Design a protein around this ligand. Structure first.
Ligand code: MG
Ligand code: MG
Ligand code: MG
Ligand code: MG
Ligand code: MG
Ligand code: MG
Ligand code: MG
Ligand code: MG
Ligand code: MG
Ligand code: MG
Ligand code: MG
Ligand code: MG
Ligand code: MG
Ligand code: MG
Lengths: 96, 110, 438, 167, 98, 204, 97, 129
RNA sequence: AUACCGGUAGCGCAAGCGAAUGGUAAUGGAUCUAAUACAACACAUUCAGACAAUCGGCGGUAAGGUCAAUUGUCAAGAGGAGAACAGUCCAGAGGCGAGGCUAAGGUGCCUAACAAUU
RNA sequence: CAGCUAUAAUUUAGCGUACCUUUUGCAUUAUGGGUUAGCUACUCAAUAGACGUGAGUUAAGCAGAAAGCUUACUGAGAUUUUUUUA
C-alpha cells in the first residue's frame, strides 16, 4: 500500500508536518498573552445551582457554601483555586 | 496462487524439467491455462466456419451457393441453423437435395 | 472571512460564544436559526448531551418549528423529537422541573406524543414529595409543565389534584399572563368537570385574578385574547359574572392592544368579546379593528378567515364589511387548490428558517390538507353562505369560490377526513353559493 | 400521422466518442449497443438527437409499429413442406469408448458384480500412513505390535487397479 | 475544535499598506483543513495563547517570592541533526564527534 | 479561472434566489388579495400491442415417468429438435447432453414438441417454424455437473492473476421415439415391448 | 493515419492505401442512416402534436432507495397516537365508501 | 438412471457423535433423512459412525463405481444438494468432460453418409453442359 | 418566454465591421441520475507520460524532436481488421455452449463468405 | 516459450512473441534466477486522531479511595395543544 520507490516507501524517514521547505506554520505571529486568572477557577452556572435546588440536593434555606456544592456533585471536579459563579437565571427562592 | 499438487498433476504430461521441477512447471501450467482460455473461445468460430464450408460444398453440388440457400431458407421461415444443416449435408444428402431443389423452386417461380 | 462565499463571523454571536464560562452546547443550540442546523449541532455532540442540553434542544426545536410556518408533522421535526425522546427515556428520573417542563412543552408543541408510561414517570417525579418541586420553581416552569401535561394525553385527575393543591397558595405571586395557560391546560384535559375540586378552585381563583382591572390593562397583547376567551367560556359556570366593569375594561384594553396581535389572533379576540357581551360588536370598535382585519387578510390561515367570516357574517350590507369580506373571499380563493400553483415555484422553496413553510404554503397549496382545514373548509363554506350580499356583487369570484370549496370537500372526503353530516352541510353551503353565482 | 414518440437505437459505441457526445447519449438513456428506447417528441429530445445523428438510429412510433407488424406476420407459423425425393461408415476407438460409456447398456448389474479392485492409495494417505509409522517407530519401538503388524501388512501383496486420470 | 491563528503580514512595513489592508490583517482566520488535520492528529490541544500562571490567583501565592520571575520565551528551533524533526526532510549524521 | 477549485458561485446564486422567495410570495399574495405549460396524461407507451406469436413452446412437457428397465431398437426415422439453446438432429436410442433442463426429473418422459424437421428414407417433412403433430419423446437420465473447466486470467508485468474452476451443469436425454413421420417401407422394428411408462398425460 | 515517416509503420511505404469498395459501401450505409435520422428529425419537428406526449417513467433507483430509507425512518420516528389517528381516518374513509 | 435402472445402489453416511463438524450431518440424519428414504425407495442408506473423523458421504453405483465426498461443516441444505448431485448422476468425476458436440448415437446416417457415389449420375449431366 | 458578455477567423486603404463554436443567468423537462453533490470525516496514490487526428510557437511549414490548445486511445484494455503492430478503425472481456444477428473489414486461392450488379 | 482446442484418436489441423522488476513504451539484444529443499521483510511499547463494538450515565476513565489527576456538562423565558360554532 506504499506505491513505488519514493521516500514514503522507505519508512519512518519523513515527519508528517514537513511540507516541502516552505515553513508555512512558521509564518504566523507568536502571541505571549497569558489569559487572566478565573480560567483556573471552576465556573458554575446559576442554572445548575437552581436545578440542584429544585432536585432537592441543595438546602436553599441554609447557606449554600462551596462545601455543599462540592458534596452534592454540583461542582463536577475538584476545586483547586475556587468557584466563579456566572448566571442570569430565574430564581423563585432567596439564596445566600 | 495455485495449489502445488494441482500444478504438478497439470504438468504431469509435459516434457523435460517442466514436468518434475515445480517452478518451471508453474510458469508452464499458467501459460497452458492462458492457452486454454483462447482455445475455448476459438472453438465456436472454428466450428461455425467448418459448418459453413460443408453447407457451401453440399449446396454447390446442386448448383446453388451458400448465400442463395441461406437467404431462401430464411425467407421461407425455416429455422434450421448451420449445425443441423451441415449434419444433413454429411449424413442425409437426399434431404439436403430436396431442400436445395425446393428453395430453387420457390425462389425461381418467375 | 474564510473563503469568499462562506459567511463572515457575526459580531454578537462571536462575543457570546467566546467565554471562559461553560455552557457551549446550549449556546450553540440557542444560536441555531434553523432545523437541520440544530440537528447537525445535535449530531456533533450526540455523545456529549446532558439533561440541560436536552431541555434547551426541545425548547429550541419548538421555537424553530413555530418560527417557520411549516407543519410540526414534518419528518425533520419528528426525527429531532424522537432523538430527544431517546435521551428523555435515558434521564427520566434525573430531569428537574425546569428540564421536565422544557421537554414536555417542547415535545407537545411539535405534537410528538411520548409513551404514556414515560409521561407517568415524568409527572410522578414532579410530585414525588410534599409538593416541594412546585414551590421552588418559578411561574413559567409551572406554566410550561401544565402546557406539556395538557398535551401527551395524561388526564389522570389525581396528579392534577396535587398539582393544583401545590400551586393554589402560590398563584397570586404569579405574573398575570401565565394564568391563561394554566386555565387552558386545566380545560384541555378532562379536568374542570360538569361541561377534582382543587382544580376548579385554582381555576376560579385564576379567573378572579384575571377578571380584575389594573391587570387586564397590563397583560401583554395576544394574552388578552386567550383571557377573554377563557372568561367568556367559563364565567357563569364557575366564576365572575355579566357585570359591565369587566366588559368595559376588555373593550378599553382591546382598543389599545389592536396592532400587536398577529392576523391569526384578531378574530379570536373579537369573537371572545362578542361572546363576552352575550354573557354583538359595539360601535366605533369595529370601525377601527376592521382596517386591521382587511390589512391582516393578506396573510391569514383558513381557520382564521373562518373566524373573521363568522365575525362578519351577521352584517354584510356595510361597504367596509363588504370589501373586507371580499378580501377574505380572495384569500380563501388563494390558499385553496384549484379544481382544474403559479404564485411561486416549488423548485425554489427555501430550506432556510424565516417563513420557508409559508413559501411551501403557496407553490401548490395542496398538501396542507390536514384534518383542521378539512373541517374548516366546511366552516368557511357555512360562513360564506351566511354572508350573501357582500360577495354576490362579484359573480365569477363566488362561482370560482364555490368550485374550489366543492373540489376541496371532495378531495378531503376521498382522503377520509370528513363525514356525512359535514358533507351535507358543505353541499348545502356550496349549492347556496353556486345558486348565488349565476 | 402525428409523431407522438421516437424510437432511438445506438449503432455505435462509447469508446472513442468525445465526452460531450457521450454525455448527450447518457442523457438520452442509452447505455449499450442495439438498445432501443422510446423517447417523447418535444424540442428537448429533438435537440439531443440532432446533436448526435451519426451515432443513433431514430424511427417514428408508426414506423416501428409497421416494422414489428411486418416481422410478426413473417414469424407466424406456416404449413410444412412435404418433400418426397425417394450402413454406417466406421467408428474410431475413442468413439467406441464414448458409446461404451453412454449408449450401450453395460453398467446395469449390481455393485457386487462389476466391482473392481480399489485404486492404489492417494499420495496424501500414503504421507499420513508414513507419518503414523514414523510416530510408532519413535515412541513405541521397532519391536512393538504396531510396528510388526504394519510390517506384516506391508509385506503381503495387494490387489489394485491402475490410475487412468491425472488425480 | 477549530484551530485559529492571527493573520501574517502585519508585524512591520505598515507604511506601504492601505488602510483597508491593515484593517483586514488585524482579523484572525482558521487554519486550512489539511494543516488543521495534521495538527489535530499530532495531538495539538492548546486552549490559550500562553499558559495561565497557577500563581496570581488570590490566596495562591509564593511563600517567599514577592511574585515570581516571568522568563520571556524565544521561538527559534531548526537543526537537521538534533531539534524539530517536523522542520527537516531527513536526519543529518553528526560532524565527526571530535 | 486557473484555480482548479470548485467555485461557490452556484451556491451563492441559489442562496440569493431562495432568500428573496418569501418576499416574492407575500407581495404576490398581497396583490392577489388587495386587488404555464399544458401537460398530457402520462401514457406508458405510444405503440399499440402486436399480439406476439405463440410457438409450440413446450420443449419439455413431462408426459410420464419410466417404471423399470426398457430397451430401444434402432429405427430408420430422424427429427431435428430445437432444445436448450441449440438444435440437434436426433434418432431413437440416442443420447443428448444439453444445458440443464429445469422442471424435469430423472426417469421422467418429456415431449420435445419444437420439431423443425422430420425425416425418413422416403420423405422429409421440412417444417416452416415447426411441424404440427411432430413430437419426440425423451427420457431424462442425468442431472450432472460436467468436468471442471480451469479459467485462468493473467496480465504480464502487472500483478494481476485470477483463477476460477467452474463445472458446467448438463442433462443427459435418451430419445425414446420420433412421432409424426413414419418409416419408408416399415420393413422391420420387430414390435419390441413398448417402453413401460406412467403416462400422467397422453395424446396417442 | 496520415504519417509516412518516423520509423513506426502506421501505413505502408506509400503514405496511405485508399478506400476499397467495401469501405465505400460501409460509409455509404452509415451516411444513409445519418440522413434518414435527420430527415426523420425534420419530419417529427413538423408533425409534433400540440400538448406533446409524456411517457410514464418510474423513479430511478437512487430516489427509490432514498425514499424507502426516508419512509422507514418515518416509521421509527412516529408518535404514540399516530397509528390510531391514521386508523380512525382509514375507517372514516370506508364508511363513506 | 440408465435405461430405467436407477444406477445408485447404495449410499453410505459416516458421522461423529461429539465432533463439531457433524452438527449439520446429525441434523440432516434427524430431520431430513426419513424424507430422503421415503422419496427414494430404491436406495439403500447405511449409517456408519466414526467417533473422531469428519463426516463423509460415500456413493455406491451400479456400474461398480464408488465416489467418496466429505461434507464437513455443511448445513443440511448443502448435504441435500450434494446427495441431489450424487443421486441424479452416474458418478463421473471432475476429469471426464463429455464430447463437445453434445450428441452421441449409434447409427447417425439414415439414407447413408454422403460419398463419392451418391450423386454420380447427376454430375456427369452437369459436366455434359 | 430568452437576455447579457467576448473583439478573435474572415473582410477593410485605414477608422472600424464581424461570425461559428463558447461562457453565464432565468424558465421548462414522467430527458438522464444501481447514482451524483458536499464534507474541519478518515485512508491513500499521483505530481517522469506517450502517440494519432484538428488547430499553433520554436525547429528546416525536418525529427516516434521539444513546448501550447481541443478530442481520443494507450498508460491501466483483452477481442476482430490493418500481413506482422502500445497510441489507427470497430468494439469495452463474470463463466460455460459444436446456438443466432451484426460493426470495422471483406466476399478469386492461402482464408469464412454471392460467375450478386456481370 | 514445447503447450492449447479438438469425434484428431500409431497422427493430423488450427491457435500460441516465458515470468519478474522498472518504464511513455520490453519477446526484447534492459534487471534477476542452474535446479530442488530449508531459512528470509510492515513487529512491539507509549502517546494522538478517526471509525466499528460497547460500558457507565448518580457525568466518564485511572486508583484501595468522599486524596488526587485527565476528559465531559452548566440556558432561554421564544403562544404553542381537542376536526369546525355561539
Ligand atoms: Mg485454438
Ligand atoms: Mg461469435
Ligand atoms: Mg466509437
Ligand atoms: Mg477430530
Ligand atoms: Mg483580424
Ligand atoms: Mg489530453
Ligand atoms: Mg481507457
Ligand atoms: Mg486492443
Ligand atoms: Mg491483429
Ligand atoms: Mg492460444
Ligand atoms: Mg528481478
Ligand atoms: Mg544471469
Ligand atoms: Mg523454496
Ligand atoms: Mg477517600
Amino acid at each position: 500500500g506504499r506505491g513505488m520507490k519514493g521516500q514514503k516507501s522507505r519508512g519512518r524517514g519523513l515527519h508528517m508536518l514537513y511540507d516541502g521547505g516552505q515553513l508555512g506554520l512558521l509564518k504566523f505571529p507568536v502571541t505571549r498573552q497569558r489569559p487572566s486568572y478565573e480560567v483556573l477557577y471552576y465556573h458554575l452556572g446559576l442554572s445548575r445551582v437552581a436545578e440542584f435546588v429544585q432536585l432537592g440536593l441543595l438546602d436553599a434555606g441554609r447557606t449554600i457554601t462551596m462545601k455543599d456544592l462540592y458534596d452534592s456533585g454540583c461542582v463536577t471536579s475538584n476545586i483547586k483555586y475556587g468557584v466563579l459563579l456566572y448566571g442570569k437565571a430565574r430564581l423563585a427562592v432567596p439564596l445566600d | 496462487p495455485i495449489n502445488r499438487q494441482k500444478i504438478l498433476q497439470l504438468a504431469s504430461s509435459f516434457r523435460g524439467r517442466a514436468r518434475t521441477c515445480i517452478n518451471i512447471a508453474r510458469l508452464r501450467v499458467e501459460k497452458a491455462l492462458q492457452h486454454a482460455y483462447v482455445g475455448r473461445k476459438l472453438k465456436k468460430r472454428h466450428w461455425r466456419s467448418v459448418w459453413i464450408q460443408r453447407i457451401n460444398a453440399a449446396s454447390r453440388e446442386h448448383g446453388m451457393s451458400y448465400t442463395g440457400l441461406i437467404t431462401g431458407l430464411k425467407a421461407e421461415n425455416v429455422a434450421l441453423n448451420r449445425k443441423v444443416l451441415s449434419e444433413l449435408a454429411m449424413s442425409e444428402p437426399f434431404s439436403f437435395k430436396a431442400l436445395v431443389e425446393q428453395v430453387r423452386h420457390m425462389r425461381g417461380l418467375p | 472571512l474564510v473563503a469568499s462565499g462562506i459567511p463572515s463571523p457575526r459580531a454578537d454571536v462571536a462575543l457570546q460564544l467566546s467565554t471562559p464560562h461553560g455552557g457551549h452546547i446550549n449556546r450553540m443550540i440557542n444560536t441555531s436559526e434553523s432545523i437541520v442546523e440544530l440537528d447537525s449541532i445535535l449530531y456533533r455532540f450526540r455523545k456529549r448531551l446532558r439533561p440541560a442540553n436536552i431541555g434547551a434542544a426541545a425548547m429550541r426545536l419548538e421555537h424553530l418549528n413555530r418560527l417557520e410556518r411549516r407543519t410540526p408533522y414534518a419528518l425533520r421535526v419528528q426525527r429531532v423529537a424522537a432523538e430527544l425522546q431517546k435521551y428523555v427515556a435515558t434521564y427520566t428520573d434525573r430531569l428537574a422541573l425546569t428540564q421536565a417542563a422544557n421537554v414536555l412543552r417542547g415535545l407537545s408543541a411539535v405534537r410528538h406524543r411520548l409513551p404514556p408510561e414515560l409521561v407517568l414517570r415524568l409527572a410522578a417525579g414532579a410530585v414525588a414529595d410534599g409538593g416541594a418541586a412546585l414551590r421552588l420553581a418559578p411561574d413559567v416552569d409551572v406554566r410550561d409543565l401544565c402546557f406539556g401535561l395538557a398535551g401527551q394525553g395524561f388526564n389522570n385527575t389525581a396528579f392534577w389534584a396535587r398539582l393544583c393543591a401545590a400551586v393554589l397558595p402560590r398563584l397570586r405571586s404569579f405574573d398575570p399572563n401565565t394564568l391563561p395557560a394554566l386555565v387552558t391546560a386545566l380545560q384541555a384535559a378532562q379536568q374542570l368537570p360538569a361541561p377534582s375540586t382543587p382544580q376548579a378552585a385554582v381555576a376560579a381563583e385564576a379567573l378572579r385574578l384575571l377578571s380584575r382591572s389594573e391587570t387586564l390593562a397590563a397583560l401583554a397583547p395576544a394574552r388578552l385574547a386567550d383571557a377573554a376567551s377563557l372568561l367568556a367560556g367559563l364565567g357563569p359556570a364557575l366564576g365572575v359574572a355579566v357585570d359591565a366593569r369587566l366588559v368595559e375594561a376588555v373593550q378599553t384594553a382591546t382598543a389599545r392592544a389592536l396592532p400587536s396581535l398577529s392576523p391569526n389572533q384578531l378574530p379570536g379576540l373579537l369573537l371572545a368579546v362578542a361572546a363576552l357581551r352575550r354573557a354583538q360588536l359595539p360601535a366605533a370598535l369595529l370601525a377601527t379593528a376592521l382596517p386591521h382585519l382587511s390589512a391582516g387578510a393578506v396573510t391569514m390561515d383558513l381557520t382564521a378567515v373562518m373566524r373573521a367570516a363568522r365575525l362578519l357574517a351577521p352584517h354584510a350590507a356595510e361597504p367596509a364589511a363588504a370589501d373586507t369580506l371580499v378580501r377574505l373571499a380572495r384569500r380563501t380563493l388563494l390558499l385553496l387548490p384549484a379544481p382544474g400553483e403559479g404564485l411561486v415555484t416549488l423548485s425554489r422553496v427555501p430550506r432556510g428558517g424565516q417563513a420557508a413553510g409559508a413559501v411551501l404554503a403557496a407553490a401548490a397549496p395542496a398538501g396542507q390538507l390536514q384534518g383542521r382545514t378539512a373541517g374548516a373548509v366546511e366552516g368557511v363554506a357555512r360562513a360564506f353562505a351566511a354572508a350573501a350580499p357582500a360577495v354576490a356583487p362579484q359573480p365569477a369570484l363566488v362561482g370560482e369560490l364555490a368550485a374550489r370549496l366543492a373540489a376541496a370537500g371532495e378531495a378531503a372526503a376521498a382522503r377520509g377526513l370528513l363525514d356525512e353530516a359535514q358533507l351535507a352541510s358543505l353541499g348545502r353551503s356550496v349549492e347556496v353559493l353556486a345558486a348565488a353565482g349565476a | 400521422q402525428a409523431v407522438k414518440s421516437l424510437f432511438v437505437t445506438l449503432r455505435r459505441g462509447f469508446a472513442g466518442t468525445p465526452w460531450f457526445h457521450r454525455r448527450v447519449l447518457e442523457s438520452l438513456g442509452l447505455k449499450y449497443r442495439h438498445q432501443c428506447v422510446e423517447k417523447p417528441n418535444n424540442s428537448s429530445i429533438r435537440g439531443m438527437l440532432s446533436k448526435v445523428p451519426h451515432l443513433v438510429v431514430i424511427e417514428t412510433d408508426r414506423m416501428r409499429y409497421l416494422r414489428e407488424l411486418k416481422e410478426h406476420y413473417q414469424q407466424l407459423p406456416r404449413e410444412p413442406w412435404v418433400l418426397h425425393h425417394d450402413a454406417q461408415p466406421r467408428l474410431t476407438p475413442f468413439a467406441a469408448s464414448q458409446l461404451r460409456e453412454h449408449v450401450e447398456p453395460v453398467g446395469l448389474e449390481g455393485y457386487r458384480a462389476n466391482k473392481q479392485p480399489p485404486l492404489p492409495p492417494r499420495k496424501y494417505f500414503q504421507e499420513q500412513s508414513r507419518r503414523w509409522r514414523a510416530k510408532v517407530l519413535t515412541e513405541r519401538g521397532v519391536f512393538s505390535a504396531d510396528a510388526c503388524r504394519e510390517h506384516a501388512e506391508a509385506i503381503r501383496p495387494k490387489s489394485y487397479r491402475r490410475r487412468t486420470g491425472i488425480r | 475544535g477549530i484551530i485559529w491563528h492571527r493573520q501574517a503580514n502585519y508585524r512591520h512595513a505598515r507604511h506601504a499598506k492601505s488602510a483597508s489592508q491593515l484593517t483586514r490583517l488585524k482579523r484572525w482566520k482558521p487554519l486550512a483543513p489539511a494543516f488543521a488535520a495534521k495538527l489535530r492528529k499530532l495531538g495539538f490541544s492548546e486552549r490559550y495563547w500562553a499558559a495561565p500562571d497557577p500563581q496570581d490567583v488570590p490566596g495562591f501565592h509564593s511563600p517567599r517570592g514577592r511574585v515570581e520571575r516571568p522568563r520571556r520565551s524565544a521561538v527559534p528551533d531548526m537543526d537537521h541533526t538534533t531539534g524539530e524533526p517536523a522542520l527537516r526532510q531527513s536526519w543529518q549524521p553528526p560532524n565527526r564527534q571530535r | 479561472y486557473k484555480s482548479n477549485k470548485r467555485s461557490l458561485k452556484p451556491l451563492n446564486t441559489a442562496a440569493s434566489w431562495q432568500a428573496v422567495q418569501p418576499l416574492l410570495a407575500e407581495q404576490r399574495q398581497r396583490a392577489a388579495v388587495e386587488g404555464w405549460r399544458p401537460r398530457l396524461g402520462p401514457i406508458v407507451d405510444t405503440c399499440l400491442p402486436p399480439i406476439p406469436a405463440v410457438p409450440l413452446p413446450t420443449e419439455c412437457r413431462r408426459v410420464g415417468v419410466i417404471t423399470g428397465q426398457y430397451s430401444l431398437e434402432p429405427e430408420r426415422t430422424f427429427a431435428v429438435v430445437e432444445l436448450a439453446g441449440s438444435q440437434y438432429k436426433v434418432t431413437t436410442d440416442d443420447v443428448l447432453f444439453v444445458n440443464q433442463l429445469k422442471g424435469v426429473a430423472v426417469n421422467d418422459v418429456v415431449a420435445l414438441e419444437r420439431v423443425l424437421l422430420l425425416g425418413s428414407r422416403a420423405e422429409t417433412v421440412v417444417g416452416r417454424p415447426y411441424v404440427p403433430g411432430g413430437v419426440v419423446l425423451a427420457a431424462v437420465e442425468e442431472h450432472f455437473r460436467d468436468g471442471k473447466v480451469h479459467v485462468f486470467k493473467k496480465r504480464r508485468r502487472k500483478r494481476y492473476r485470477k483463477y476460477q474452476a467452474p463445472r458446467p451443469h448438463l442433462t443427459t436425454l435418451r430419445i425414446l421415439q420420433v412421432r409424426g413421420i413414419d418409416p419408408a417401407p416399415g420393413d422391420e422394428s420387430a414390435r419390441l415391448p413398448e417402453l413401460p411408462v406412467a403416462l400422467l398425460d397422453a395424446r396417442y | 493515419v496520415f504519417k509516412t515517416t518516423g520509423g513506426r509503420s502506421w501505413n505502408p511505404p506509400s503514405g496511405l492505401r485508399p478506400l476499397s469498395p467495401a469501405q465505400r459501401r460501409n460509409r455509404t450505409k452509415n451516411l444513409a442512416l445519418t440522413m434518414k435520422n435527420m430527415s426523420i428529425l425534420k419530419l417529427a419537428e413538423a408533425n409534433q402534436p400540440e400538448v406533446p406526449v409524456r411517457l410514464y417513467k418510474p423513479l430511478n433507483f437512487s430516489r427509490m432507495q432514498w425514499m424507502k430509507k426516508k419512509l422507514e425512518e418515518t416509521r421509527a420516528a412516529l408518535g404514540w397516537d399516530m397509528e390510531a389517528r391514521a386508523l380512525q381516518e382509514q375507517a372514516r374513509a370506508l364508511r363513506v365508501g | 438412471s440408465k435405461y430405467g435402472v436407477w444406477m445408485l445402489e447404495s449410499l453410505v453416511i459416516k458421522y461423529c457423535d461429539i465432533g463439531g463438524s457433524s452438527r449439520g450431518m446429525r441434523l440432516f440424519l434427524d430431520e431430513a433423512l426419513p424424507a430422503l428414504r421415503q422419496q427414494n425407495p430404491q436406495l439403500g442408506v447405511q449409517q456408519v459412525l466414526q467417533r473422531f473423523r469428519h463426516p463423509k458421504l460415500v456413493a455406491v453405483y451400479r456400474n461398480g463405481r464408488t465416489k467418496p465426498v466429505c461434507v464437513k461443516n455443511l448445513a443440511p441444505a448443502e448435504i441435500m444438494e450434494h446427495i441431489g448431485w450424487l443421486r441424479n448422476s452416474h458418478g463421473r468425476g471432475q476429469e471426464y468432460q463429455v464430447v463437445r458436440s453434445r450428441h452421441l448415437s449409434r447409427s447417425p446416417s439414415i439414407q447413408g453418409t454422403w460419398s463419392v457415389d451418391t450423386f454420380a449420375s447427376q454430375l456427369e449431366r452437369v459436366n455434359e453442359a
